[PDB]
Design a binder for this molecule. Sequence first.
Ligand code: NA
Length: 151
Amino acid sequence: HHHHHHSSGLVPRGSHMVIPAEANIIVGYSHFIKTVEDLNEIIRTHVPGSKYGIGFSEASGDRLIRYDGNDDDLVKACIENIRRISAGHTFVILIRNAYPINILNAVKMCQEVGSIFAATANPLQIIVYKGERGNGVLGVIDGYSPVGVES
Ligand code: NA
């Protein structure tokens, strides 16, 4: 027996992500991860020298938004983004002052323990579906639609 509420379904206005100036964001789905420390560690060697924040949506147990980082503004943005999405096992990473290869490697490392929804510096909107127990991430709007074809 399952419970249905008419309030469930695609959330009309996608959730806009808070991306502080010059920050790069990574939004993904964790695989069998129970703590944000796993993410904090797997990307630790790639974020040295840079400022970063990590947010993780614990999907059971305490069901708390978990976080780590070395920059208050980035950490707060990650927490807010996780709150807006409100979907179990979602993780959000924000990195600033990092070279291109470090950002790319951070993403590759996340792919070892999860799936990627977004990885960009562009304005970003997360399309979410509101279900019974919580939400689910259906996709993202990364930047804009094309305006033409290159010559
Ligand atoms: Na999808």
